[PDB]
Design goal:
part of a larger assembly; 6 chains; A alpha/beta (about 70); B mainly alpha (about 50); C alpha+beta (about 90); D alpha+beta (about 110); E mainly alpha (about 50); F mainly beta (about 200); B: about 50 residues; mainly alpha; 1 helix; elongated; C: about 90 residues; alpha+beta; 2 helices; RNA-binding; Large ribosomal subunit protein eL39 (chain B); Ribosomal_eL39_dom_sf (chain B); Ribosomal_eL39 (chain B); ribosomal protein (chain B); structural constituent of ribosome (chain B)
RNA sequence: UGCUUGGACUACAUAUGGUUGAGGGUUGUA
RNA sequence: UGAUCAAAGUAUCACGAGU
RNA sequence: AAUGAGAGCCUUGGAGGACUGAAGUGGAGAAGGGUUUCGUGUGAACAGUGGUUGAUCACGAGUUAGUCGGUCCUAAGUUCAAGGCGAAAGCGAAAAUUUUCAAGUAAAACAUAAUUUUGAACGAAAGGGAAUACGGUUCCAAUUCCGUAACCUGUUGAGUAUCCGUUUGUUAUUAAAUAUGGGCCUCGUGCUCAUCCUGGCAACAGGAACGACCAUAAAGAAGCCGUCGAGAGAUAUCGGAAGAGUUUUCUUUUCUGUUUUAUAGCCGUACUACCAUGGAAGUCUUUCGCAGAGAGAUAUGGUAGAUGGGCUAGAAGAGCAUGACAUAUACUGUUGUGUCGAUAUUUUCUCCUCGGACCUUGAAAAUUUAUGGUGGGGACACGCAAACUUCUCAACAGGCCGUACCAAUAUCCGCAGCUGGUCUCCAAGGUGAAGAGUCUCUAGUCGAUAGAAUAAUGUAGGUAAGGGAAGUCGGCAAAUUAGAUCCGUAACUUCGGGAUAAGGAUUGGCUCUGAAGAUUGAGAUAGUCGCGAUUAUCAAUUAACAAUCAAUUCAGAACUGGCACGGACUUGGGGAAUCCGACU
RNA sequence: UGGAAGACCGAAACAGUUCUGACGUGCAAAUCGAUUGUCAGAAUUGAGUAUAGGGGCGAAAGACCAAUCGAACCAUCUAGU
């Protein structure tokens, strides 16, 4: 999913795009990662904090479909 | 071979159809000489070869 | 060790191909592979690349030469002779 | 033992476009993949001393790459050898400069006859 | 040769001495590890006596 | 398969604005980067090419044209050279001595490169191994290591044959004897050890 | 325009007709 | 051990159009 | 054991003896085969035997690709349009001449204006080469289906120097201002300049920042052997999550299990090359191997290939592995844990920097890019902009043909399921020099019609007192000998050899000892806070300094057994002459 | 130290020395065992490809050219005599 976004601000810019019909969210006890599917880079932000991760779930724009992998 | 040219594959494919034992109700025809399919090409008995 | 007094380099050919032929080889295989003074870099960094071609490792000036020797005996005489005829025609 | 290795390509032979590096495949299955020849550095070709800043790629991968990676920004980026480019500016300067000295000498000699 | 390399940076022996020693690594007379420093220190010592 | 190395020499094309590079036959003292000047009005410098009127007699030349413009038929291989012996003023001819010691008269318009062609003496190294004789030949053509036709059989060669051991007729054979009777000493004026002072008068 | 599918055409030698042409072959107007 | 293409220049006529 | 009419094999589990012995009777493919693959039914014929079963016989199913090959490209080479020649066909022909037979313009004026001469094509499934990975899934298929994540090409949309001189804002400062200039006028937004990028001394750095056109260079692009440098996977071995096995005895033991993708971001060495500083002599630096240095070394400080590895995104306590839980259970769901080191061996390959050898000097073409130059266009700063953009993301499309298995003592070619022949890829443990032979593990076999007898004669394998070639055509066959280390070593000689000459010694096991490497650390003193923590200094110390870690090599000494000691296996009988061809 | 050589011992590999062995109505129209030559190069070899019959090719035996070579094979002249 080749391109890494370290920085929260850039991940969110990609959230409001013409593309990115689909998002996956996974809350993992290893590393909680927020995945956004643009068909050939899917981009991923790894929020390591977990506290920040609970709040970052919404700021995701509502018109975008989210898979809530538990 | 093992990956067969398309011309070859079509000729062999027709040959596979020939290798069928004659429908047994055709054998019952009036002046029916056909007892069997007798051109049955069994690959290690009659090749196609050359 | 001066391992072999007589043969030097021709010990590769050892027992094969008769002693008189092997003496001839010793001179030629010394002159080839030998570092010659490049007239165009003044450094002794010229080594035989292939049969008639000597490349200077530094400056990369590649000079055409005799097959085993940078200067063949004919060549030296050749070059002096043309040069001398050049002087008389001009003035 | 461990896990032996199978040719994915029908090109069985150890030929130059068929070279195989051993890869632990995620299912632990340990299967061969086919490796392209490692690209040789484009040469500085008036003295073949391997171009800095200019990418080695199998040639038909330099239009699948950005124009800036194939390039050193100054005059004779690929063609000439950097160190040899100082030499070749100097050479041209001198041939032109001392020709003018020759030309000025001839002009003066004509008048003063 | 690597022993001499380390010593060059520390500064114990002069560059001059190291060269002679480096050429004597190749060509046997420094047979073990043990031979090399005994020679270095004798060389140093003989120079200390002259000085 | 040429013992003599060649020089790639690149020029201006005076007709179209392009570099055209031509392969000249490298004379000894031809170092890469020497300016070579190909011309009527040329200084006698190794490897300049000059028409034969311009070079004073006793100058040695390489790559000499027998007809002007036939692009340098002669003296192409290692250390061969022709010498300009002088001139015949009537019908503008320069006379040369060919590397056969044969003397031939050529037009003075004929261009030739002042030179002795590099990697000469290619001959000096005896060989030692017939692996190197094989290796020489496999570059050049299928010049077979020469099976003796005596060793053969009479169908295969007219010389082979034998319970004993012979050619059986003079291997000396005419020019007029017509192919394939030209197995041998094809019109030998004299056969048997050349005694003496070889060099043509 | 992009991308994609179907049909019909696109050999050569040669005659005639068609028109474009052409050569210090050669003629003429200037 | 290097580069040459777009005739620049000069001269005579065109010296029209638009404002 | 099961089944059937019948069962040593063939049907098959469990079990049990073994086999090939990872240079395979294995696991893949080409060349080849052509339905042979696979399920089901299963009888006669076939499997020189049986045969319920099969490569048989009957009935069905199965080979999905933009990224792998074909395709495309050229090679050796070929098909052929020519002027011709031939009886024609055709040219055991490469003929190759044929107004400009030629390639051609995002170009216009006066032969439009530059250049440019076999047209054409085929020809390698191993050469060159646009681009795919992992897991799951079939009875039989997968780099191909599916899922999931990429990558290329064509094309299509958005973005990617610019917001300044000036200034809205602010009294100014200041800020937007990528960076703007100069002068006038009391002043000015009045006159008014540029704008096809920037930084770095350089080595050169980067996300884009004029393809219209010429030339030039590089890539593509190349043998063999030797070694070095660095990696991957296998291998050796310790600890620690687990399971298994042994457990009379002893064993934290033995086996097994511990995994990480294309692709992208960042990091980026050994090595090399280059640059700046600087000027080396007292040769220095340095490789295993000797290459470089006033063509600037060493050193010091840098730069560059992404060469090789690292870490992340890939990765849903993923997938996957291991052991459990739930449900008899399947399916499916759930629970952890998936980890720490060491080493060079390569019983392998890849890649870097090199060299040896040569009267060998180790493809071509498609194809791709680079740089210099000549147009033009974009040339407004209240700044709009743009930009085949050989950019960054996203949209669409990608055709055509192949893909089963076999690749051999059963799918090939030999009338055959024939000891034959038939090119390669893949790499475990131990012994050891060996990819040797031999044993073993994994994988695959156990079918070569069998049983009882095991006669002669055989074949294939051995042994034989004493004598020892008497044998015979002839030491043929057979045996001796063999490895290693040490000692010793002639005739003759082209001085290289002869040579492993000859002739001798010795080899196990156990138990010690020595030698042979890597890396930092100590020691001494002082100040501060409570031996602990924080800070400062110095060179000697130094042949293991000492300490520790590594991993085996080569030597020496005892003890020891019934001469047992290359114990299997591996594996020259020797010398003296002569004839003949120099030799391989 | 290094690592040369159409070097040597000998594997893979190729060949076939001697047993004038097995077999010789065989497994085989040339195999099998033992033994053995050579094995870094005039090496081994696949695919593509050239050379075709009174011709080719030949490290040369009259060898080979699809089990065939002192002139292939096939048909025809040819029910030749």
């Amino acid at each position: 999913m080749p391109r890494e976004i370290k920085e929260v601000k850039d991940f969110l810019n990609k959230a409001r795009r013409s593309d990115a019909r689909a998002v996956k969210i996974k809350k993992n006890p290893t590393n909680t990662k927020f995945k956004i599917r643009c068909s050939r880079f899917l981009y991923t932000l790894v929020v390591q904090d977990k506290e920040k991760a609970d709040k970052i779930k919404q700021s995701l724009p509502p018109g975008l479909q989210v898979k809530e992998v538990k | 071979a093992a990956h067969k040219s398309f011309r070859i594959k079509q000729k062999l494919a027709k040959k596979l159809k020939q290798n069928r034992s004659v429908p047994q109700w055709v054998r019952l025809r009036t002046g029916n000489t056909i007892r069997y399919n007798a051109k049955r090409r069994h690959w290690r008995r009659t090749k196609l070869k050359l | 060790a001066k391992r072999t007094k007589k043969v030097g380099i021709v010990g590769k050919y050892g027992t094969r191909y008769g002693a008189s032929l092997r003496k001839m080889v010793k001179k030629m295989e010394i002159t080839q592979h030998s570092k010659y003074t490049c007239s165009f870099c003044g450094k002794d960094s010229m080594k035989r690349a292939v049969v008639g071609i000597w490349s200077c490792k530094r400056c990369k000036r590649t000079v055409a030469g005799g097959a085993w020797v940078y200067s063949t005996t004919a060549a030296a005489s050749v070059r002096s002779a043309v040069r001398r005829l050049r002087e008389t025609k001009e003035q | 033992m461990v896990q032996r290795l199978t040719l994915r390509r029908r090109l069985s032979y150890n030929t130059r476009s068929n070279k195989r590096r051993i890869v632990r495949t995620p299912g632990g299955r340990l299967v061969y993949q086919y490796v392209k020849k490692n690209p040789t550095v484009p040469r500085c070709g008036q003295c073949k001393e391997k171009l800095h800043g200019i990418t080695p790629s199998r040639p038909s991968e330099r239009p699948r790459m950005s124009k800036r990676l194939k390039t050193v920004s100054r005059t004779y980026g690929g063609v000439l050898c950097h160190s040899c480019l100082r030499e070749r500016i100097v050479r041209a300067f001198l041939i032109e400069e001392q020709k003018i000295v020759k030309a000025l000498k001839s002009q003066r000699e004509a008048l003063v006859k | 040769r690597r022993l001499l390399k380390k010593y060059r940076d520390s500064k114990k022996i002069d560059r001059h001495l190291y060269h002679d020693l480096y050429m004597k690594c190749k060509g046997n007379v420094f047979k073990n590890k043990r031979v090399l420093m005994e020679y270095i220190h004798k060389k140093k010592a003989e120079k200390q006596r002259s000085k | 398969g040429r013992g003599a190395p060649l020089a790639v020499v690149h020029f201006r094309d005076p007709y179209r604005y392009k570099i055209r590079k031509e392969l000249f036959i490298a004379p000894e003292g031809m170092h890469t980067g020497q300016f070579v000047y190909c011309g009527r009005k040329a200084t006698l410098q190794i490897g300049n090419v000059m028409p034969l009127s311009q070079m004073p007699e006793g100058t040695i030349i390489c790559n000499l044209e027998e007809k002007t413009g036939d692009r340098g038929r002669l003296a192409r291989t290692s250390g061969n050279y022709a010498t300009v012996i002088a001139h015949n003023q009537d019908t503008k001819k320069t006379r040369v001595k060919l590397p056969s010691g044969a003397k031939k008269v050529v037009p003075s318009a004929n261009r030739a490169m002042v030179g002795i062609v590099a990697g000469g003496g290619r001959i000096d190294k005896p060989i030692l191994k017939a692996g190197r004789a094989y290796h020489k030949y496999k570059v050049k053509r299928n010049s077979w290591p020469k099976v003796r036709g005596v060793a053969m059989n009479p169908v295969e060669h007219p010389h082979g044959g034998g319970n004993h051991q012979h050619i059986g007729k003079a291997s000396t054979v005419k020019r007029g004897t017509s192919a394939g009777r030209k197995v041998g000493l094809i019109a030998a004026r004299r056969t048997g050890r050349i005694r003496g002072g070889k060099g043509d008068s």
